[PDB]
Tab-separated table of C-alpha atoms in Angstrom:
chain	number	residue	atom	x	y	z
A	57	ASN	CA	2.222	-7.483	15.063
A	58	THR	CA	4.861	-6.113	12.670
A	59	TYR	CA	8.235	-4.384	12.435
A	60	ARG	CA	10.055	-3.522	9.210
A	61	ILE	CA	13.757	-3.345	8.344
A	62	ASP	CA	14.921	-2.382	4.858
A	63	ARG	CA	17.903	-3.923	3.073
A	64	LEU	CA	20.237	-2.847	0.285
A	65	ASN	CA	22.819	-4.188	-2.157
A	66	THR	CA	26.173	-2.989	-3.510
A	67	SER	CA	27.426	-1.602	-6.818
A	68	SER	CA	29.905	-2.849	-9.414
A	69	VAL	CA	32.904	-0.738	-10.417
A	70	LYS	CA	33.298	-0.460	-14.195
A	71	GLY	CA	35.890	1.131	-16.464
A	72	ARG	CA	35.862	3.864	-19.105
A	73	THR	CA	38.960	4.781	-21.111
A	74	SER	CA	38.727	7.868	-23.280
A	75	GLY	CA	35.387	8.674	-24.900
A	76	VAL	CA	33.055	5.784	-24.180
A	77	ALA	CA	29.765	6.453	-22.420
A	78	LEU	CA	29.337	5.428	-18.798
A	79	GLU	CA	26.990	2.472	-18.382
A	80	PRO	CA	24.613	2.926	-15.422
A	81	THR	CA	23.816	0.131	-12.995
A	82	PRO	CA	20.914	-0.453	-10.589
A	83	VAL	CA	20.943	-1.336	-6.892
A	84	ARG	CA	18.319	-3.845	-5.783
A	85	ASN	CA	16.756	-3.855	-2.323
A	86	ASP	CA	14.384	-5.851	-0.136
A	87	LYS	CA	12.899	-5.830	3.371
A	88	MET	CA	12.092	-8.064	6.333
A	89	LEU	CA	9.277	-8.178	8.879
A	90	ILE	CA	9.148	-9.278	12.519
A	91	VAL	CA	5.680	-10.135	13.830
A	92	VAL	CA	4.584	-10.377	17.469
A	93	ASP	CA	2.073	-13.190	17.981
A	94	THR	CA	1.564	-14.415	21.553
A	95	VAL	CA	1.690	-13.066	25.099
A	96	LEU	CA	3.268	-15.004	27.959
A	97	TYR	CA	1.633	-15.007	31.369
A	98	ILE	CA	1.757	-16.285	34.938
A	99	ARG	CA	-1.373	-16.080	37.104
A	100	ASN	CA	-1.309	-17.248	40.726
A	101	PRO	CA	-4.465	-16.350	42.674
A	102	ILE	CA	-4.461	-16.212	46.464
A	103	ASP	CA	-7.631	-16.331	48.547
A	104	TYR	CA	-8.201	-13.601	51.124
A	105	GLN	CA	-8.561	-16.065	53.986
A	106	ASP	CA	-5.329	-17.928	53.231
A	107	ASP	CA	-3.448	-14.629	53.004
A	108	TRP	CA	-4.994	-13.532	56.311
A	109	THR	CA	-3.706	-16.702	58.009
A	110	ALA	CA	-0.195	-17.256	56.620
A	111	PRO	CA	2.904	-15.096	56.082
A	112	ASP	CA	3.261	-13.312	52.761
A	113	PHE	CA	5.064	-15.331	50.084
A	114	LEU	CA	4.426	-12.928	47.199
A	115	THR	CA	8.055	-11.802	46.962
A	116	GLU	CA	9.360	-15.334	46.383
A	117	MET	CA	6.639	-16.044	43.822
A	118	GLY	CA	7.591	-12.826	42.046
A	119	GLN	CA	11.243	-13.860	41.988
A	120	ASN	CA	10.270	-17.291	40.653
A	121	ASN	CA	8.184	-15.707	37.891
A	122	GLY	CA	11.100	-13.466	36.974
A	123	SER	CA	13.399	-16.481	36.782
A	124	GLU	CA	11.000	-18.382	34.514
A	125	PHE	CA	10.598	-15.387	32.216
A	126	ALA	CA	14.379	-14.902	32.071
A	127	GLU	CA	14.908	-18.557	31.163
A	128	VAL	CA	12.297	-18.330	28.405
A	129	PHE	CA	13.826	-15.072	27.135
A	130	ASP	CA	17.245	-16.697	26.781
A	131	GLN	CA	15.859	-19.889	25.258
A	132	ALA	CA	13.798	-17.984	22.683
A	133	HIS	CA	16.812	-15.912	21.662
A	134	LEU	CA	18.911	-19.057	21.240
A	135	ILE	CA	16.151	-20.841	19.302
A	136	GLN	CA	16.021	-17.957	16.847
A	137	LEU	CA	19.824	-17.937	16.609
A	138	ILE	CA	19.954	-21.656	15.784
A	139	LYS	CA	17.001	-21.661	13.384
A	140	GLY	CA	18.396	-18.881	11.200
A	141	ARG	CA	21.370	-20.975	10.116
A	142	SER	CA	19.460	-22.348	7.106
A	143	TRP	CA	18.726	-18.855	5.755
A	144	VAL	CA	19.565	-18.896	2.050
A	145	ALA	CA	20.158	-15.264	1.155
A	146	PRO	CA	18.043	-13.893	-1.717
A	147	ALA	CA	19.939	-13.847	-4.994
A	148	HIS	CA	19.172	-10.202	-5.755
A	149	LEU	CA	21.152	-9.269	-2.627
A	150	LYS	CA	24.100	-11.624	-2.979
A	151	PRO	CA	27.272	-9.617	-2.213
A	152	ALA	CA	25.951	-7.545	0.689
A	153	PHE	CA	24.044	-10.532	2.130
A	154	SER	CA	25.624	-13.971	2.366
A	155	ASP	CA	23.900	-17.139	3.530
A	156	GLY	CA	23.846	-18.374	7.100
A	157	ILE	CA	26.676	-20.428	8.562
A	158	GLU	CA	26.062	-24.027	9.621
A	159	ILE	CA	29.074	-26.233	10.362
A	160	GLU	CA	28.798	-29.965	11.034
A	161	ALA	CA	31.465	-31.026	13.537
A	162	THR	CA	30.633	-34.724	13.373
A	163	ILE	CA	33.348	-35.711	15.857
A	164	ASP	CA	31.445	-35.398	19.141
A	165	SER	CA	31.432	-39.015	20.324
A	166	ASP	CA	30.818	-38.331	24.017
B	4	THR	CA	-12.542	-15.455	28.235
B	5	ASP	CA	-15.973	-14.115	29.170
B	6	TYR	CA	-16.150	-11.952	26.032
B	7	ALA	CA	-14.638	-14.540	23.667
B	8	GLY	CA	-16.235	-14.216	20.253
B	9	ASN	CA	-17.374	-10.647	20.973
B	10	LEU	CA	-13.953	-8.986	21.189
B	11	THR	CA	-13.286	-6.148	18.788
B	12	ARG	CA	-9.748	-6.382	17.439
B	13	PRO	CA	-8.361	-2.869	16.786
B	14	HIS	CA	-6.677	-3.781	13.493
B	15	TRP	CA	-7.289	-7.507	12.905
B	16	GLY	CA	-10.110	-6.902	10.442
B	17	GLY	CA	-12.333	-9.196	8.430
B	18	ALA	CA	-15.584	-11.112	8.441
B	19	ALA	CA	-14.387	-12.939	11.564
B	20	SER	CA	-11.713	-10.308	12.342
B	21	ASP	CA	-9.038	-12.947	11.734
B	22	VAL	CA	-6.953	-11.172	9.067
B	23	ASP	CA	-3.632	-9.564	9.968
B	24	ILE	CA	-3.801	-5.891	8.958
B	25	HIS	CA	-1.167	-3.794	10.725
B	26	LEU	CA	1.125	-0.853	10.004
B	27	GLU	CA	4.737	-1.953	9.507
B	28	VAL	CA	6.850	0.113	11.895
B	29	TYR	CA	9.832	1.470	9.951
B	30	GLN	CA	12.418	3.400	11.987
B	31	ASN	CA	14.597	4.166	8.929
B	32	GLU	CA	16.856	1.262	9.931
B	33	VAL	CA	18.303	0.277	6.548
B	34	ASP	CA	21.329	-2.019	6.462
B	35	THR	CA	23.729	-3.035	3.718
B	36	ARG	CA	27.194	-4.500	3.157
B	37	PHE	CA	30.011	-4.039	5.659
B	38	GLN	CA	32.541	-1.355	4.795
B	39	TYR	CA	36.107	-2.202	3.795
B	40	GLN	CA	39.128	0.095	4.045
B	41	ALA	CA	41.924	0.165	1.481
B	42	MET	CA	45.257	-0.902	2.956
B	43	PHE	CA	47.757	-0.498	0.102
B	44	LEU	CA	48.069	3.254	0.677
B	45	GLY	CA	51.126	2.677	2.859
B	46	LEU	CA	52.209	-0.523	1.121
B	47	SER	CA	53.225	1.185	-2.137
B	48	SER	CA	54.901	4.389	-3.256
B	49	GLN	CA	52.362	7.029	-4.272
B	50	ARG	CA	53.092	9.265	-7.255
B	51	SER	CA	50.887	11.933	-8.808
B	52	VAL	CA	50.671	12.780	-12.503
B	53	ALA	CA	47.618	14.953	-11.893
B	54	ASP	CA	47.316	17.655	-14.576
B	55	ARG	CA	50.861	16.981	-15.825
B	56	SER	CA	50.725	13.834	-17.989
C	222	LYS	CA	-34.821	39.497	-10.434
C	223	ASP	CA	-32.614	42.587	-10.834
C	224	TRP	CA	-29.108	41.854	-12.079
C	225	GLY	CA	-28.761	45.506	-13.110
C	226	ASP	CA	-31.285	48.305	-12.559
C	227	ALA	CA	-30.399	50.383	-15.616
C	228	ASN	CA	-30.599	50.187	-19.412
C	229	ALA	CA	-31.686	47.035	-21.297
C	230	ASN	CA	-29.590	43.894	-20.793
C	231	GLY	CA	-29.974	40.462	-19.240
C	232	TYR	CA	-26.956	39.231	-17.262
C	233	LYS	CA	-26.991	35.508	-16.475
C	234	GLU	CA	-24.199	33.013	-15.834
C	235	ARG	CA	-24.752	29.246	-15.709
C	236	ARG	CA	-23.917	28.927	-12.022
C	237	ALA	CA	-25.517	26.756	-9.337
C	238	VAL	CA	-29.238	26.626	-8.565
C	239	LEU	CA	-30.680	25.528	-5.219
C	240	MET	CA	-33.304	22.987	-6.280
C	241	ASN	CA	-33.994	20.521	-3.439
C	242	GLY	CA	-31.903	22.214	-0.789
C	243	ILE	CA	-28.812	21.028	-2.679
C	244	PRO	CA	-26.878	23.474	-4.906
C	245	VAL	CA	-26.834	22.094	-8.453
C	246	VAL	CA	-23.438	23.406	-9.501
C	247	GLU	CA	-22.523	23.091	-13.169
C	248	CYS	CA	-19.388	21.355	-14.401
C	249	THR	CA	-17.786	21.303	-17.846
C	250	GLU	CA	-15.251	18.543	-17.108
C	251	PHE	CA	-17.272	15.361	-17.579
C	252	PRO	CA	-15.371	12.855	-19.744
C	253	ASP	CA	-16.140	11.228	-23.086
C	254	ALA	CA	-13.590	8.491	-23.867
C	255	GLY	CA	-10.621	6.687	-22.349
C	256	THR	CA	-7.802	9.009	-23.416
C	257	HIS	CA	-7.148	10.243	-19.873
C	258	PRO	CA	-3.417	10.786	-19.200
C	259	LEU	CA	-3.737	8.924	-15.887
C	260	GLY	CA	-4.590	5.985	-18.099
C	261	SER	CA	-5.340	2.290	-17.592
C	262	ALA	CA	-7.616	3.178	-14.666
C	263	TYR	CA	-9.560	6.294	-15.762
C	264	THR	CA	-10.671	5.002	-19.164
C	265	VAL	CA	-14.307	5.975	-19.682
C	266	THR	CA	-16.535	3.316	-21.203
C	267	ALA	CA	-19.507	4.105	-23.420
C	268	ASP	CA	-21.836	3.480	-20.476
C	269	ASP	CA	-19.630	5.538	-18.149
C	270	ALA	CA	-19.940	8.561	-20.459
C	271	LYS	CA	-23.706	8.800	-19.887
C	272	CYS	CA	-23.306	9.513	-16.151
C	273	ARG	CA	-23.934	13.258	-16.272
C	274	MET	CA	-25.119	14.163	-12.751
C	275	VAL	CA	-23.303	13.122	-9.566
C	276	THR	CA	-24.259	13.866	-5.959
C	277	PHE	CA	-21.780	13.475	-3.119
C	278	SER	CA	-20.438	14.906	0.106
C	279	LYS	CA	-17.750	17.539	-0.342
C	280	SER	CA	-15.792	16.375	2.713
C	281	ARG	CA	-15.883	12.570	3.017
C	282	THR	CA	-16.482	11.221	-0.509
C	283	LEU	CA	-13.101	11.821	-2.171
C	284	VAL	CA	-9.396	12.020	-1.385
C	285	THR	CA	-6.453	13.351	-3.403
C	286	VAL	CA	-3.200	11.638	-2.432
C	287	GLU	CA	-0.292	13.811	-3.578
C	288	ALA	CA	3.365	12.825	-3.721
C	289	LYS	CA	4.574	15.772	-5.827
C	290	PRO	CA	2.416	18.921	-5.957
C	291	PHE	CA	2.181	21.198	-8.985
C	292	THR	CA	5.587	22.535	-10.007
C	293	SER	CA	6.750	24.646	-12.960
C	294	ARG	CA	10.517	24.642	-13.436
C	295	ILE	CA	12.821	26.226	-16.025
C	296	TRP	CA	16.221	24.620	-16.592
C	297	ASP	CA	18.742	25.697	-19.213
C	298	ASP	CA	19.803	23.014	-21.670
C	299	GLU	CA	23.426	23.597	-22.644
C	300	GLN	CA	24.108	20.889	-25.235
C	301	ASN	CA	20.954	21.922	-27.087
C	302	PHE	CA	20.357	25.668	-27.187
C	303	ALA	CA	17.146	25.720	-25.163
C	304	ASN	CA	15.589	27.351	-22.096
C	305	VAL	CA	13.237	24.400	-21.861
C	306	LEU	CA	10.386	24.715	-19.357
C	307	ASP	CA	9.106	21.650	-17.509
C	308	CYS	CA	5.781	21.556	-15.689
C	309	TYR	CA	4.950	18.324	-13.871
C	310	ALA	CA	2.747	17.001	-11.075
C	311	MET	CA	2.303	13.482	-9.675
C	312	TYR	CA	-0.816	12.529	-7.716
C	313	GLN	CA	-3.591	9.939	-7.418
C	314	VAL	CA	-7.284	10.389	-6.622
C	315	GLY	CA	-9.371	7.746	-4.898
C	316	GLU	CA	-12.997	7.524	-3.834
C	317	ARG	CA	-13.224	6.993	-0.093
C	318	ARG	CA	-16.747	5.948	0.922
C	319	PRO	CA	-18.357	5.377	-2.502
C	320	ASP	CA	-21.691	4.926	-0.701
C	321	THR	CA	-21.926	8.729	-0.431
C	322	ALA	CA	-21.940	9.214	-4.226
C	323	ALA	CA	-25.113	9.211	-6.345
C	324	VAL	CA	-24.518	9.193	-10.091
C	325	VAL	CA	-27.397	9.321	-12.566
C	326	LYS	CA	-27.022	7.420	-15.824
C	327	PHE	CA	-28.980	8.853	-18.763
C	328	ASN	CA	-30.144	6.239	-21.277
C	329	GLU	CA	-30.866	8.608	-24.191
D	6	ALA	CA	-11.873	-12.604	-15.041
D	7	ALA	CA	-11.845	-15.368	-12.427
D	8	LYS	CA	-12.707	-12.976	-9.558
D	9	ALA	CA	-16.445	-12.224	-9.634
D	10	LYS	CA	-17.742	-13.452	-6.276
D	11	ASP	CA	-19.263	-10.425	-4.458
D	12	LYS	CA	-18.390	-11.086	-0.804
D	13	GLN	CA	-15.938	-13.946	-1.415
D	14	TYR	CA	-13.466	-11.557	-3.053
D	15	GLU	CA	-12.932	-10.042	0.394
D	16	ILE	CA	-12.184	-13.506	1.791
D	17	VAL	CA	-9.772	-14.245	-1.069
D	18	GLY	CA	-7.850	-11.012	-0.546
D	19	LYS	CA	-7.895	-11.546	3.215
D	20	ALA	CA	-6.386	-15.025	2.904
D	21	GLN	CA	-3.734	-13.687	0.530
D	22	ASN	CA	-2.823	-10.982	3.048
D	23	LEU	CA	-2.823	-13.527	5.882
D	24	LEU	CA	-0.281	-15.671	4.050
D	25	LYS	CA	1.757	-12.596	3.151
D	26	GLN	CA	1.848	-11.763	6.870
D	27	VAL	CA	2.722	-15.233	8.228
D	28	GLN	CA	5.134	-16.655	5.626
D	29	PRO	CA	7.307	-13.562	4.914
D	30	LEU	CA	7.882	-13.262	8.659
D	31	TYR	CA	9.269	-16.809	8.376
D	32	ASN	CA	11.284	-16.104	5.216
D	33	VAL	CA	14.351	-16.537	7.436
D	34	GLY	CA	15.005	-20.201	6.701
D	35	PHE	CA	11.860	-21.677	5.132
D	36	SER	CA	10.843	-24.854	6.943
D	37	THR	CA	7.925	-27.267	7.167
D	38	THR	CA	5.625	-24.710	8.822
D	39	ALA	CA	5.799	-22.274	5.903
D	40	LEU	CA	5.320	-25.166	3.485
D	41	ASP	CA	2.231	-26.314	5.391
D	42	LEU	CA	0.795	-22.792	5.327
D	43	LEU	CA	1.455	-22.510	1.588
D	44	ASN	CA	-0.130	-25.911	0.940
D	45	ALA	CA	-3.211	-24.963	2.959
D	46	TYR	CA	-3.544	-21.679	1.073
D	47	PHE	CA	-3.186	-23.389	-2.304
D	48	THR	CA	-5.730	-26.072	-1.399
D	49	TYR	CA	-8.079	-23.247	-0.404
D	50	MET	CA	-7.420	-21.510	-3.727
D	51	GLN	CA	-8.106	-24.726	-5.643
D	52	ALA	CA	-11.377	-24.980	-3.721
D	53	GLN	CA	-12.200	-21.426	-4.876
D	54	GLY	CA	-11.609	-22.098	-8.583
D	55	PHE	CA	-7.979	-20.989	-9.016
D	56	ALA	CA	-6.124	-23.527	-11.182
D	57	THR	CA	-4.484	-26.333	-9.200
D	58	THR	CA	-1.230	-26.893	-7.340
D	59	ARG	CA	0.859	-29.920	-6.423
D	60	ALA	CA	1.433	-30.385	-2.692
D	61	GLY	CA	5.215	-30.149	-2.559
D	62	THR	CA	7.661	-31.371	0.047
D	63	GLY	CA	10.804	-29.242	0.055
D	64	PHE	CA	12.743	-26.272	-1.305
D	65	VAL	CA	15.660	-25.687	-3.654
D	66	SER	CA	18.170	-22.937	-4.520
D	67	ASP	CA	17.269	-19.224	-4.307
D	68	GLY	CA	13.757	-19.233	-5.735
D	69	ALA	CA	12.565	-18.409	-2.231
D	70	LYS	CA	13.346	-14.775	-3.047
D	71	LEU	CA	10.869	-14.770	-5.928
D	72	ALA	CA	8.405	-16.674	-3.738
D	73	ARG	CA	8.504	-14.013	-1.008
D	74	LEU	CA	8.350	-11.171	-3.526
D	75	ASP	CA	5.277	-12.731	-5.125
D	76	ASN	CA	3.746	-13.097	-1.657
D	77	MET	CA	4.142	-9.347	-1.159
D	78	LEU	CA	2.910	-8.614	-4.689
D	79	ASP	CA	-0.237	-10.700	-4.218
D	80	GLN	CA	-0.905	-9.004	-0.879
D	81	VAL	CA	-0.553	-5.459	-2.202
D	82	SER	CA	-2.455	-6.177	-5.424
D	83	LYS	CA	-5.376	-7.861	-3.653
D	84	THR	CA	-6.140	-5.434	-0.819
D	85	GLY	CA	-6.079	-1.753	-1.700
D	86	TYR	CA	-5.442	-2.179	-5.423
D	87	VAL	CA	-8.371	-4.245	-6.729
D	88	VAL	CA	-10.762	-5.062	-3.875
D	89	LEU	CA	-10.469	-2.048	-1.586
D	90	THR	CA	-11.027	1.512	-2.755
D	91	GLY	CA	-8.231	2.335	-5.193
D	92	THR	CA	-8.137	3.788	-8.673
D	93	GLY	CA	-11.066	1.455	-9.333
D	94	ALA	CA	-13.477	0.890	-6.456
D	95	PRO	CA	-15.226	-2.187	-7.949
D	96	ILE	CA	-13.391	-5.182	-9.379
D	97	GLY	CA	-13.650	-5.173	-13.163
D	98	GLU	CA	-12.183	-7.233	-15.967
D	99	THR	CA	-8.819	-5.459	-15.789
D	100	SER	CA	-8.366	-5.636	-12.011
D	101	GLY	CA	-9.606	-9.222	-11.925
D	102	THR	CA	-7.153	-10.158	-14.671
D	103	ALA	CA	-4.323	-8.425	-12.806
D	104	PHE	CA	-5.115	-10.318	-9.603
D	105	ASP	CA	-5.427	-13.604	-11.502
D	106	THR	CA	-2.029	-13.047	-13.120
D	107	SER	CA	-0.559	-12.210	-9.712
D	108	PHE	CA	-1.883	-15.499	-8.335
D	109	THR	CA	-0.525	-17.325	-11.387
D	110	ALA	CA	2.910	-15.798	-10.801
D	111	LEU	CA	2.741	-16.856	-7.146
D	112	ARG	CA	1.764	-20.395	-8.164
D	113	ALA	CA	4.613	-20.581	-10.680
D	114	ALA	CA	7.040	-19.337	-8.027
D	115	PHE	CA	5.799	-21.999	-5.604
D	116	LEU	CA	6.137	-24.757	-8.205
D	117	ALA	CA	9.636	-23.628	-9.182
D	118	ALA	CA	10.649	-23.269	-5.515
D	119	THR	CA	9.083	-26.431	-4.041
D	120	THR	CA	10.122	-30.040	-4.624
E	57	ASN	CA	3.417	5.802	-2.638
E	58	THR	CA	0.393	4.459	-0.727
E	59	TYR	CA	-1.961	6.148	1.709
E	60	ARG	CA	-4.261	4.256	4.053
E	61	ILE	CA	-7.749	5.086	5.317
E	62	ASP	CA	-8.972	2.669	7.980
E	63	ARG	CA	-12.676	1.808	7.900
E	64	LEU	CA	-14.715	0.699	10.913
E	65	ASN	CA	-18.274	-0.466	11.584
E	66	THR	CA	-20.994	0.499	14.094
E	67	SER	CA	-22.858	-1.310	16.870
E	68	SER	CA	-26.475	-1.725	17.929
E	69	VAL	CA	-28.127	-0.590	21.170
E	70	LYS	CA	-29.905	-2.759	23.744
E	71	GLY	CA	-32.085	-2.382	26.832
E	72	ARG	CA	-31.580	-3.762	30.348
E	73	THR	CA	-34.452	-3.690	32.825
E	74	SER	CA	-33.344	-4.401	36.383
E	75	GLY	CA	-30.782	-7.198	36.700
E	76	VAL	CA	-30.465	-8.472	33.152
E	77	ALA	CA	-26.858	-9.091	32.156
E	78	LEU	CA	-25.309	-6.876	29.492
E	79	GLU	CA	-24.363	-8.531	26.199
E	80	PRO	CA	-21.255	-7.281	24.364
E	81	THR	CA	-21.010	-6.957	20.600
E	82	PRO	CA	-18.008	-6.786	18.263
E	83	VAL	CA	-17.329	-4.293	15.489
E	84	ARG	CA	-15.520	-5.057	12.239
E	85	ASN	CA	-12.954	-2.965	10.386
E	86	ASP	CA	-10.992	-3.010	7.128
E	87	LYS	CA	-8.426	-0.894	5.299
E	88	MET	CA	-8.188	1.163	2.123
E	89	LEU	CA	-5.146	1.942	-0.028
E	90	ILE	CA	-4.628	4.670	-2.627
E	91	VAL	CA	-1.516	4.015	-4.722
E	92	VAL	CA	0.135	6.778	-6.752
E	93	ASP	CA	1.052	5.352	-10.156
E	94	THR	CA	1.824	7.838	-12.951
E	95	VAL	CA	2.941	11.422	-13.544
E	96	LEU	CA	1.426	14.283	-15.531
E	97	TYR	CA	3.731	16.712	-17.303
E	98	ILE	CA	4.072	19.207	-20.134
E	99	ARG	CA	7.419	20.291	-21.596
E	100	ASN	CA	7.966	23.438	-23.681
E	101	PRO	CA	11.460	23.993	-25.120
E	102	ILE	CA	12.453	27.466	-26.299
E	103	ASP	CA	15.738	27.902	-28.155
E	104	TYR	CA	18.306	30.404	-26.901
E	105	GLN	CA	18.280	32.308	-30.188
E	106	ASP	CA	14.503	32.746	-30.197
E	107	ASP	CA	14.662	33.708	-26.515
E	108	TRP	CA	17.208	36.448	-27.232
E	109	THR	CA	15.014	38.196	-29.823
E	110	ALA	CA	11.582	37.970	-28.188
E	111	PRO	CA	9.883	39.078	-24.960
E	112	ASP	CA	9.401	36.230	-22.522
E	113	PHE	CA	6.322	34.045	-22.952
E	114	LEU	CA	7.358	31.746	-20.097
E	115	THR	CA	4.941	33.408	-17.668
E	116	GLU	CA	1.833	32.978	-19.825
E	117	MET	CA	2.751	29.393	-20.707
E	118	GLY	CA	3.069	28.584	-17.010
E	119	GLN	CA	-0.460	29.846	-16.393
E	120	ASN	CA	-1.738	27.886	-19.393
E	121	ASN	CA	-0.121	24.714	-18.053
E	122	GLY	CA	-1.641	25.370	-14.640
E	123	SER	CA	-5.043	25.746	-16.285
E	124	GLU	CA	-4.745	22.457	-18.175
E	125	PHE	CA	-3.558	20.690	-15.022
E	126	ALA	CA	-6.566	22.053	-13.127
E	127	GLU	CA	-8.863	20.810	-15.894
E	128	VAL	CA	-7.329	17.330	-15.723
E	129	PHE	CA	-7.582	17.461	-11.918
E	130	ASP	CA	-11.331	18.080	-12.061
E	131	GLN	CA	-11.820	15.533	-14.849
E	132	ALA	CA	-9.969	12.809	-12.939
E	133	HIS	CA	-11.993	13.496	-9.802
E	134	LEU	CA	-15.223	13.232	-11.801
E	135	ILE	CA	-14.069	10.000	-13.460
E	136	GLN	CA	-13.336	8.525	-10.034
E	137	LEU	CA	-16.765	9.593	-8.776
E	138	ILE	CA	-18.482	8.041	-11.800
E	139	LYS	CA	-16.556	4.757	-11.851
E	140	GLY	CA	-17.421	3.865	-8.246
E	141	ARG	CA	-21.167	3.791	-8.808
E	142	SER	CA	-21.469	-0.013	-8.623
E	143	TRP	CA	-19.305	-0.485	-5.516
E	144	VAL	CA	-20.939	-3.189	-3.409
E	145	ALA	CA	-20.195	-3.176	0.270
E	146	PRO	CA	-18.650	-5.935	2.397
E	147	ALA	CA	-21.050	-7.746	4.689
E	148	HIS	CA	-19.105	-6.906	7.868
E	149	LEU	CA	-19.474	-3.124	7.425
E	150	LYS	CA	-23.004	-3.161	6.003
E	151	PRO	CA	-24.815	-1.006	8.624
E	152	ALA	CA	-22.108	1.665	8.313
E	153	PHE	CA	-21.137	1.299	4.637
E	154	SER	CA	-23.858	0.627	2.071
E	155	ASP	CA	-23.814	-0.159	-1.635
E	156	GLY	CA	-23.148	2.532	-4.197
E	157	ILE	CA	-26.352	3.874	-5.707
E	158	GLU	CA	-27.256	3.920	-9.407
E	159	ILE	CA	-30.119	6.006	-10.796
E	160	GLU	CA	-31.309	5.750	-14.400
E	161	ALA	CA	-33.344	8.326	-16.307
E	162	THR	CA	-34.454	8.607	-19.930
E	163	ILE	CA	-34.456	12.003	-21.649
E	164	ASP	CA	-35.121	12.949	-25.276
E	165	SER	CA	-32.403	15.510	-25.968
E	166	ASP	CA	-33.686	16.569	-29.410
């Protein structure tokens, strides 16, 4: 139900000439959390008597379940790719972290 | 479920055990800006006045 | 009793006494006011100063979270002529399971 | 000061932690879901005697950073700093004031970040 | 800078005669956090010139500082014990965790 990743910013190069004191600078940081919520499932029961009186189909059902889970895997990854485009980066990490890219190609008259 | 309402949630703790209380896994995966490499080393003549003037 | 079986002297130290099966150890570190260096959370109110007898478990009633243990360090200052000695320690104490503690307020 | 409720302080801190575990996970592109969660939490807080908050419809600029940081601050200050066993096991005037100021900062961040 | 102790409740016990179904019960849990905030220190500067013309006192001063730190250690532990006297317990851990106990006595010192 959680997973943490830390972030970091950059520094600014400054100039001293002959006898001036160096001026220190800070480096801000942040984090991000990924939370697991739900569990996917497929449950197909088979009665004893029907299994005793018909050839086994369990391999094809297993393949079908794998296909459905693969489709959902891909679709979830793409949903998260296309929902992160409106991510406005926090100001305190501006140079090391830019905002997401969303481009409107409004010339798709099919 | 048959036990619904009587489940003990290992870390979801509260009066109704409906409060998210978990330990953030941190694998020391810290990320920052992307590194840039200077290119004008070969694009300009290099001279040294180190410890001379 | 017999602290020493010779001459004439009475040797007693104000150590613990087993009263009700519980050793009543003495302590000289009870606080008075709110000038504790770990301030803003260990300030002792006027009522809190009258708590002069506490009973607890010695295993499950307290915890001492330490990030830097005791450390005495000598570093030579060059700009200022000084073999300055630092001695620092960072920690925090918290009361796990307060239900196991039994203070006794004394109302004069 | 505004947190003297015996067993409702646990509920208050729990709700604060719940928001700070559902909204910061969705800090990647705030949307209507996070806004709905924030509105529900603030209506709950108004029902508990914690100032008042306008509903709000959108977002603007990079105040979302301060909003998320105040989410985390409210979470850490509620559970394990004031309510749970910390430097002060009970909630006194000082800890209650600190938590109230944390909620006020969160409310100000929400108002400055929401349309 | 934080350390966590996880609390947890207890459960009751029942009795089943011959065919009576068994009834499950839940148990509630919480968390605790101890946050390290400030630092204790003591600094003793000794000039070079005074160091040159005197036997070292650095060893005795170290022991003195250790003694004062031990005193503050005990005092802080006692303050924490005293301040938690009125700690009420949450209703979902009540059988396991109870309220902190206060006892009052009146004594004429003089």
